[PDB]
PDB file of all heavy atoms in Angstrom:
ATOM      1  N   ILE A   9      50.132 -13.222  19.757  1.00  0.00           N
ATOM      2  CA  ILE A   9      48.783 -13.620  19.355  1.00  0.00           C
ATOM      3  C   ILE A   9      48.839 -15.075  18.861  1.00  0.00           C
ATOM      4  O   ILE A   9      49.708 -15.395  18.029  1.00  0.00           O
ATOM      5  CB  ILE A   9      48.292 -12.791  18.151  1.00  0.00           C
ATOM      6  CG1 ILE A   9      48.539 -11.282  18.350  1.00  0.00           C
ATOM      7  CG2 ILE A   9      46.841 -13.124  17.822  1.00  0.00           C
ATOM      8  CD1 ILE A   9      47.863 -10.730  19.554  1.00  0.00           C
ATOM      9  N   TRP A  10      47.942 -15.955  19.314  1.00  0.00           N
ATOM     10  CA  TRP A  10      47.776 -17.252  18.602  1.00  0.00           C
ATOM     11  C   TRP A  10      46.363 -17.513  18.073  1.00  0.00           C
ATOM     12  O   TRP A  10      45.420 -16.709  18.304  1.00  0.00           O
ATOM     13  CB  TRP A  10      48.340 -18.462  19.365  1.00  0.00           C
ATOM     14  CG  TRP A  10      47.577 -18.890  20.528  1.00  0.00           C
ATOM     15  CD1 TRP A  10      46.662 -19.885  20.576  1.00  0.00           C
ATOM     16  CD2 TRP A  10      47.693 -18.387  21.842  1.00  0.00           C
ATOM     17  NE1 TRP A  10      46.174 -20.022  21.833  1.00  0.00           N
ATOM     18  CE2 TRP A  10      46.801 -19.128  22.647  1.00  0.00           C
ATOM     19  CE3 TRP A  10      48.453 -17.382  22.427  1.00  0.00           C
ATOM     20  CZ2 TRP A  10      46.658 -18.900  23.993  1.00  0.00           C
ATOM     21  CZ3 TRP A  10      48.311 -17.156  23.775  1.00  0.00           C
ATOM     22  CH2 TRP A  10      47.420 -17.891  24.540  1.00  0.00           C
ATOM     23  N   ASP A  11      46.266 -18.620  17.342  1.00  0.00           N
ATOM     24  CA  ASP A  11      45.062 -19.019  16.547  1.00  0.00           C
ATOM     25  C   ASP A  11      45.034 -18.211  15.286  1.00  0.00           C
ATOM     26  O   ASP A  11      44.821 -16.973  15.314  1.00  0.00           O
ATOM     27  CB  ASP A  11      43.701 -18.930  17.304  1.00  0.00           C
ATOM     28  CG  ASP A  11      42.544 -19.692  16.579  1.00  0.00           C
ATOM     29  OD1 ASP A  11      42.006 -19.150  15.579  1.00  0.00           O
ATOM     30  OD2 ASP A  11      42.121 -20.802  17.022  1.00  0.00           O
ATOM     31  N   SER A  12      45.227 -18.940  14.178  1.00  0.00           N
ATOM     32  CA  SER A  12      45.170 -18.410  12.810  1.00  0.00           C
ATOM     33  C   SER A  12      44.028 -17.444  12.556  1.00  0.00           C
ATOM     34  O   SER A  12      44.196 -16.431  11.873  1.00  0.00           O
ATOM     35  CB  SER A  12      45.137 -19.571  11.790  1.00  0.00           C
ATOM     36  OG  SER A  12      43.858 -20.202  11.752  1.00  0.00           O
ATOM     37  N   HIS A  13      42.871 -17.699  13.141  1.00  0.00           N
ATOM     38  CA  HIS A  13      41.710 -16.840  12.871  1.00  0.00           C
ATOM     39  C   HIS A  13      41.826 -15.550  13.652  1.00  0.00           C
ATOM     40  O   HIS A  13      41.376 -14.512  13.213  1.00  0.00           O
ATOM     41  CB  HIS A  13      40.429 -17.567  13.220  1.00  0.00           C
ATOM     42  CG  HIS A  13      40.390 -18.948  12.666  1.00  0.00           C
ATOM     43  ND1 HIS A  13      40.894 -20.032  13.344  1.00  0.00           N
ATOM     44  CD2 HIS A  13      40.008 -19.405  11.453  1.00  0.00           C
ATOM     45  CE1 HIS A  13      40.793 -21.106  12.581  1.00  0.00           C
ATOM     46  NE2 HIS A  13      40.264 -20.747  11.426  1.00  0.00           N
ATOM     47  N   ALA A  14      42.353 -15.610  14.858  1.00  0.00           N
ATOM     48  CA  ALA A  14      42.519 -14.367  15.645  1.00  0.00           C
ATOM     49  C   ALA A  14      43.628 -13.531  15.007  1.00  0.00           C
ATOM     50  O   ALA A  14      43.536 -12.278  14.942  1.00  0.00           O
ATOM     51  CB  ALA A  14      42.872 -14.687  17.109  1.00  0.00           C
ATOM     52  N   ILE A  15      44.681 -14.218  14.566  1.00  0.00           N
ATOM     53  CA  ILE A  15      45.816 -13.551  13.935  1.00  0.00           C
ATOM     54  C   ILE A  15      45.429 -12.782  12.682  1.00  0.00           C
ATOM     55  O   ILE A  15      45.777 -11.604  12.534  1.00  0.00           O
ATOM     56  CB  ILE A  15      46.931 -14.533  13.611  1.00  0.00           C
ATOM     57  CG1 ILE A  15      47.557 -15.098  14.921  1.00  0.00           C
ATOM     58  CG2 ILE A  15      47.964 -13.885  12.699  1.00  0.00           C
ATOM     59  CD1 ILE A  15      48.269 -16.446  14.694  1.00  0.00           C
ATOM     60  N   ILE A  16      44.689 -13.429  11.788  1.00  0.00           N
ATOM     61  CA  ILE A  16      44.394 -12.807  10.504  1.00  0.00           C
ATOM     62  C   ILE A  16      43.402 -11.656  10.657  1.00  0.00           C
ATOM     63  O   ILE A  16      43.537 -10.650   9.973  1.00  0.00           O
ATOM     64  CB  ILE A  16      44.007 -13.822   9.371  1.00  0.00           C
ATOM     65  CG1 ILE A  16      42.755 -14.619   9.679  1.00  0.00           C
ATOM     66  CG2 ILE A  16      45.153 -14.777   9.103  1.00  0.00           C
ATOM     67  CD1 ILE A  16      42.510 -15.721   8.664  1.00  0.00           C
ATOM     68  N   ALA A  17      42.465 -11.774  11.607  1.00  0.00           N
ATOM     69  CA  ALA A  17      41.590 -10.657  11.941  1.00  0.00           C
ATOM     70  C   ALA A  17      42.408  -9.484  12.529  1.00  0.00           C
ATOM     71  O   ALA A  17      42.217  -8.352  12.139  1.00  0.00           O
ATOM     72  CB  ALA A  17      40.522 -11.100  12.939  1.00  0.00           C
ATOM     73  N   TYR A  18      43.301  -9.764  13.472  1.00  0.00           N
ATOM     74  CA  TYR A  18      44.243  -8.748  14.023  1.00  0.00           C
ATOM     75  C   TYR A  18      45.029  -7.995  12.945  1.00  0.00           C
ATOM     76  O   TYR A  18      45.095  -6.788  12.936  1.00  0.00           O
ATOM     77  CB  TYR A  18      45.214  -9.462  14.970  1.00  0.00           C
ATOM     78  CG  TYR A  18      46.318  -8.632  15.496  1.00  0.00           C
ATOM     79  CD1 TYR A  18      46.148  -7.843  16.633  1.00  0.00           C
ATOM     80  CD2 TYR A  18      47.532  -8.634  14.883  1.00  0.00           C
ATOM     81  CE1 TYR A  18      47.187  -7.064  17.120  1.00  0.00           C
ATOM     82  CE2 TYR A  18      48.593  -7.890  15.364  1.00  0.00           C
ATOM     83  CZ  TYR A  18      48.428  -7.114  16.480  1.00  0.00           C
ATOM     84  OH  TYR A  18      49.488  -6.385  16.930  1.00  0.00           O
ATOM     85  N   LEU A  19      45.636  -8.750  12.043  1.00  0.00           N
ATOM     86  CA  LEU A  19      46.416  -8.201  10.942  1.00  0.00           C
ATOM     87  C   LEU A  19      45.606  -7.294  10.059  1.00  0.00           C
ATOM     88  O   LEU A  19      46.048  -6.186   9.784  1.00  0.00           O
ATOM     89  CB  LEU A  19      47.030  -9.327  10.089  1.00  0.00           C
ATOM     90  CG  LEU A  19      48.164 -10.124  10.764  1.00  0.00           C
ATOM     91  CD1 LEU A  19      48.622 -11.272   9.872  1.00  0.00           C
ATOM     92  CD2 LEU A  19      49.324  -9.228  11.172  1.00  0.00           C
ATOM     93  N   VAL A  20      44.430  -7.734   9.590  1.00  0.00           N
ATOM     94  CA  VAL A  20      43.636  -6.846   8.736  1.00  0.00           C
ATOM     95  C   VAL A  20      43.219  -5.623   9.535  1.00  0.00           C
ATOM     96  O   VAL A  20      43.346  -4.497   9.076  1.00  0.00           O
ATOM     97  CB  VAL A  20      42.363  -7.509   8.194  1.00  0.00           C
ATOM     98  CG1 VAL A  20      41.556  -6.516   7.386  1.00  0.00           C
ATOM     99  CG2 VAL A  20      42.733  -8.714   7.346  1.00  0.00           C
ATOM    100  N   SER A  21      42.744  -5.834  10.750  1.00  0.00           N
ATOM    101  CA  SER A  21      42.104  -4.741  11.483  1.00  0.00           C
ATOM    102  C   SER A  21      43.175  -3.673  11.778  1.00  0.00           C
ATOM    103  O   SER A  21      42.886  -2.515  11.832  1.00  0.00           O
ATOM    104  CB  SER A  21      41.479  -5.256  12.791  1.00  0.00           C
ATOM    105  OG  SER A  21      42.539  -5.565  13.702  1.00  0.00           O
ATOM    106  N   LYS A  22      44.419  -4.086  11.954  1.00  0.00           N
ATOM    107  CA  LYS A  22      45.448  -3.169  12.335  1.00  0.00           C
ATOM    108  C   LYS A  22      46.279  -2.598  11.148  1.00  0.00           C
ATOM    109  O   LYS A  22      46.629  -1.415  11.176  1.00  0.00           O
ATOM    110  CB  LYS A  22      46.331  -3.874  13.342  1.00  0.00           C
ATOM    111  CG  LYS A  22      47.076  -2.906  14.195  1.00  0.00           C
ATOM    112  CD  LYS A  22      47.083  -3.433  15.592  1.00  0.00           C
ATOM    113  CE  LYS A  22      47.680  -2.389  16.492  1.00  0.00           C
ATOM    114  NZ  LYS A  22      48.874  -2.994  17.135  1.00  0.00           N
ATOM    115  N   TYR A  23      46.547  -3.420  10.114  1.00  0.00           N
ATOM    116  CA  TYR A  23      47.470  -3.034   9.018  1.00  0.00           C
ATOM    117  C   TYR A  23      46.893  -2.741   7.645  1.00  0.00           C
ATOM    118  O   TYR A  23      47.611  -2.217   6.824  1.00  0.00           O
ATOM    119  CB  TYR A  23      48.535  -4.093   8.839  1.00  0.00           C
ATOM    120  CG  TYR A  23      49.390  -4.242  10.058  1.00  0.00           C
ATOM    121  CD1 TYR A  23      49.339  -5.380  10.843  1.00  0.00           C
ATOM    122  CD2 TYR A  23      50.197  -3.205  10.468  1.00  0.00           C
ATOM    123  CE1 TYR A  23      50.115  -5.501  11.988  1.00  0.00           C
ATOM    124  CE2 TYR A  23      51.002  -3.315  11.590  1.00  0.00           C
ATOM    125  CZ  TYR A  23      50.942  -4.448  12.360  1.00  0.00           C
ATOM    126  OH  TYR A  23      51.747  -4.535  13.483  1.00  0.00           O
ATOM    127  N   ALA A  24      45.628  -3.079   7.378  1.00  0.00           N
ATOM    128  CA  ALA A  24      45.084  -2.937   6.017  1.00  0.00           C
ATOM    129  C   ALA A  24      44.684  -1.501   5.763  1.00  0.00           C
ATOM    130  O   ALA A  24      44.302  -0.807   6.654  1.00  0.00           O
ATOM    131  CB  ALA A  24      43.884  -3.870   5.774  1.00  0.00           C
ATOM    132  N   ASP A  25      44.763  -1.086   4.524  1.00  0.00           N
ATOM    133  CA  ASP A  25      44.343   0.249   4.113  1.00  0.00           C
ATOM    134  C   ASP A  25      42.806   0.420   4.195  1.00  0.00           C
ATOM    135  O   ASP A  25      42.330   1.517   4.300  1.00  0.00           O
ATOM    136  CB  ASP A  25      44.801   0.530   2.662  1.00  0.00           C
ATOM    137  CG  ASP A  25      46.324   0.630   2.510  1.00  0.00           C
ATOM    138  OD1 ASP A  25      47.058   0.775   3.532  1.00  0.00           O
ATOM    139  OD2 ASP A  25      46.790   0.561   1.330  1.00  0.00           O
ATOM    140  N   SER A  26      42.060  -0.675   4.101  1.00  0.00           N
ATOM    141  CA  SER A  26      40.629  -0.690   4.287  1.00  0.00           C
ATOM    142  C   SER A  26      40.228  -2.021   4.882  1.00  0.00           C
ATOM    143  O   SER A  26      41.067  -2.928   5.051  1.00  0.00           O
ATOM    144  CB  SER A  26      39.943  -0.550   2.926  1.00  0.00           C
ATOM    145  OG  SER A  26      39.960  -1.778   2.208  1.00  0.00           O
ATOM    146  N   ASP A  27      38.930  -2.175   5.137  1.00  0.00           N
ATOM    147  CA  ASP A  27      38.415  -3.422   5.699  1.00  0.00           C
ATOM    148  C   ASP A  27      38.018  -4.429   4.638  1.00  0.00           C
ATOM    149  O   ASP A  27      37.233  -5.349   4.902  1.00  0.00           O
ATOM    150  CB  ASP A  27      37.232  -3.126   6.622  1.00  0.00           C
ATOM    151  CG  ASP A  27      35.959  -2.705   5.872  1.00  0.00           C
ATOM    152  OD1 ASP A  27      35.975  -2.510   4.633  1.00  0.00           O
ATOM    153  OD2 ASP A  27      34.906  -2.595   6.543  1.00  0.00           O
ATOM    154  N   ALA A  28      38.536  -4.305   3.435  1.00  0.00           N
ATOM    155  CA  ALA A  28      38.041  -5.163   2.392  1.00  0.00           C
ATOM    156  C   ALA A  28      38.181  -6.645   2.814  1.00  0.00           C
ATOM    157  O   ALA A  28      37.274  -7.481   2.591  1.00  0.00           O
ATOM    158  CB  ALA A  28      38.779  -4.895   1.092  1.00  0.00           C
ATOM    159  N   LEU A  29      39.311  -6.973   3.427  1.00  0.00           N
ATOM    160  CA  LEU A  29      39.592  -8.373   3.790  1.00  0.00           C
ATOM    161  C   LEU A  29      38.802  -8.901   5.009  1.00  0.00           C
ATOM    162  O   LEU A  29      38.759 -10.097   5.229  1.00  0.00           O
ATOM    163  CB  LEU A  29      41.123  -8.605   3.952  1.00  0.00           C
ATOM    164  CG  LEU A  29      41.897  -8.494   2.612  1.00  0.00           C
ATOM    165  CD1 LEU A  29      43.386  -8.544   2.839  1.00  0.00           C
ATOM    166  CD2 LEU A  29      41.486  -9.606   1.652  1.00  0.00           C
ATOM    167  N   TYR A  30      38.135  -8.012   5.742  1.00  0.00           N
ATOM    168  CA  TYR A  30      37.504  -8.339   6.995  1.00  0.00           C
ATOM    169  C   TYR A  30      36.463  -7.262   7.308  1.00  0.00           C
ATOM    170  O   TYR A  30      36.595  -6.496   8.283  1.00  0.00           O
ATOM    171  CB  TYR A  30      38.561  -8.440   8.118  1.00  0.00           C
ATOM    172  CG  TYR A  30      38.010  -9.064   9.423  1.00  0.00           C
ATOM    173  CD1 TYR A  30      37.033 -10.064   9.372  1.00  0.00           C
ATOM    174  CD2 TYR A  30      38.437  -8.641  10.693  1.00  0.00           C
ATOM    175  CE1 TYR A  30      36.507 -10.645  10.526  1.00  0.00           C
ATOM    176  CE2 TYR A  30      37.914  -9.228  11.858  1.00  0.00           C
ATOM    177  CZ  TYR A  30      36.953 -10.250  11.762  1.00  0.00           C
ATOM    178  OH  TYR A  30      36.372 -10.860  12.892  1.00  0.00           O
ATOM    179  N   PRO A  31      35.461  -7.148   6.427  1.00  0.00           N
ATOM    180  CA  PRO A  31      34.596  -5.993   6.463  1.00  0.00           C
ATOM    181  C   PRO A  31      33.973  -5.781   7.829  1.00  0.00           C
ATOM    182  O   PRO A  31      33.609  -6.756   8.502  1.00  0.00           O
ATOM    183  CB  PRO A  31      33.541  -6.294   5.388  1.00  0.00           C
ATOM    184  CG  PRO A  31      33.686  -7.757   5.059  1.00  0.00           C
ATOM    185  CD  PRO A  31      35.109  -8.073   5.334  1.00  0.00           C
ATOM    186  N   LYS A  32      33.857  -4.512   8.230  1.00  0.00           N
ATOM    187  CA  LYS A  32      33.173  -4.134   9.477  1.00  0.00           C
ATOM    188  C   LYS A  32      31.613  -4.054   9.461  1.00  0.00           C
ATOM    189  O   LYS A  32      30.975  -4.040  10.523  1.00  0.00           O
ATOM    190  CB  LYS A  32      33.736  -2.803   9.963  1.00  0.00           C
ATOM    191  CG  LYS A  32      35.194  -2.926  10.394  1.00  0.00           C
ATOM    192  CD  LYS A  32      35.844  -1.584  10.700  1.00  0.00           C
ATOM    193  CE  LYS A  32      37.323  -1.817  10.927  1.00  0.00           C
ATOM    194  NZ  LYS A  32      37.974  -0.609  11.496  1.00  0.00           N
ATOM    195  N   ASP A  33      30.984  -3.959   8.301  1.00  0.00           N
ATOM    196  CA  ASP A  33      29.508  -3.997   8.262  1.00  0.00           C
ATOM    197  C   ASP A  33      29.050  -5.253   9.030  1.00  0.00           C
ATOM    198  O   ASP A  33      29.482  -6.365   8.675  1.00  0.00           O
ATOM    199  CB  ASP A  33      29.092  -4.077   6.805  1.00  0.00           C
ATOM    200  CG  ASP A  33      27.644  -4.486   6.581  1.00  0.00           C
ATOM    201  OD1 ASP A  33      27.113  -5.408   7.241  1.00  0.00           O
ATOM    202  OD2 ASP A  33      27.063  -3.911   5.636  1.00  0.00           O
ATOM    203  N   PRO A  34      28.194  -5.096  10.078  1.00  0.00           N
ATOM    204  CA  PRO A  34      27.859  -6.241  10.940  1.00  0.00           C
ATOM    205  C   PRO A  34      27.322  -7.469  10.231  1.00  0.00           C
ATOM    206  O   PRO A  34      27.709  -8.572  10.591  1.00  0.00           O
ATOM    207  CB  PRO A  34      26.806  -5.676  11.887  1.00  0.00           C
ATOM    208  CG  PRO A  34      27.149  -4.212  11.992  1.00  0.00           C
ATOM    209  CD  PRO A  34      27.738  -3.817  10.668  1.00  0.00           C
ATOM    210  N   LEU A  35      26.455  -7.293   9.237  1.00  0.00           N
ATOM    211  CA  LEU A  35      25.909  -8.427   8.480  1.00  0.00           C
ATOM    212  C   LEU A  35      26.970  -9.140   7.669  1.00  0.00           C
ATOM    213  O   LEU A  35      27.089 -10.386   7.718  1.00  0.00           O
ATOM    214  CB  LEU A  35      24.792  -7.970   7.545  1.00  0.00           C
ATOM    215  CG  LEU A  35      23.510  -7.676   8.317  1.00  0.00           C
ATOM    216  CD1 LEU A  35      22.547  -6.856   7.478  1.00  0.00           C
ATOM    217  CD2 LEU A  35      22.873  -8.987   8.735  1.00  0.00           C
ATOM    218  N   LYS A  36      27.729  -8.348   6.907  1.00  0.00           N
ATOM    219  CA  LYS A  36      28.890  -8.874   6.198  1.00  0.00           C
ATOM    220  C   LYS A  36      29.894  -9.529   7.189  1.00  0.00           C
ATOM    221  O   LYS A  36      30.395 -10.605   6.918  1.00  0.00           O
ATOM    222  CB  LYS A  36      29.564  -7.762   5.384  1.00  0.00           C
ATOM    223  CG  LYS A  36      28.702  -7.155   4.288  1.00  0.00           C
ATOM    224  CD  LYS A  36      29.565  -6.343   3.328  1.00  0.00           C
ATOM    225  CE  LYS A  36      28.729  -5.466   2.387  1.00  0.00           C
ATOM    226  NZ  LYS A  36      29.557  -4.698   1.419  1.00  0.00           N
ATOM    227  N   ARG A  37      30.199  -8.880   8.319  1.00  0.00           N
ATOM    228  CA  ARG A  37      31.067  -9.493   9.385  1.00  0.00           C
ATOM    229  C   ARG A  37      30.566 -10.837   9.893  1.00  0.00           C
ATOM    230  O   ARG A  37      31.353 -11.766  10.137  1.00  0.00           O
ATOM    231  CB  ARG A  37      31.247  -8.530  10.600  1.00  0.00           C
ATOM    232  CG  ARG A  37      32.139  -9.068  11.747  1.00  0.00           C
ATOM    233  CD  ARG A  37      33.543  -9.518  11.306  1.00  0.00           C
ATOM    234  NE  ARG A  37      34.275  -8.360  10.799  1.00  0.00           N
ATOM    235  CZ  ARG A  37      34.921  -7.463  11.547  1.00  0.00           C
ATOM    236  NH1 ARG A  37      35.031  -7.605  12.881  1.00  0.00           N
ATOM    237  NH2 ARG A  37      35.495  -6.414  10.943  1.00  0.00           N
ATOM    238  N   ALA A  38      29.243 -10.956  10.042  1.00  0.00           N
ATOM    239  CA  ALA A  38      28.635 -12.172  10.587  1.00  0.00           C
ATOM    240  C   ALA A  38      28.819 -13.345   9.647  1.00  0.00           C
ATOM    241  O   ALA A  38      29.053 -14.478  10.113  1.00  0.00           O
ATOM    242  CB  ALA A  38      27.149 -11.960  10.889  1.00  0.00           C
ATOM    243  N   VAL A  39      28.734 -13.113   8.331  1.00  0.00           N
ATOM    244  CA  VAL A  39      29.084 -14.204   7.434  1.00  0.00           C
ATOM    245  C   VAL A  39      30.581 -14.601   7.576  1.00  0.00           C
ATOM    246  O   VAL A  39      30.895 -15.771   7.700  1.00  0.00           O
ATOM    247  CB  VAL A  39      28.787 -13.930   5.972  1.00  0.00           C
ATOM    248  CG1 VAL A  39      28.975 -15.224   5.198  1.00  0.00           C
ATOM    249  CG2 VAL A  39      27.372 -13.367   5.774  1.00  0.00           C
TER     250      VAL A  39
END
């Protein structure tokens, strides 16, 4: 994976216990 932004989204989405770091609520995601 490259690009810091793609990487950090990948990491949260795959390894975090919750979405706190990258919330899935669409409005919150859009910000």
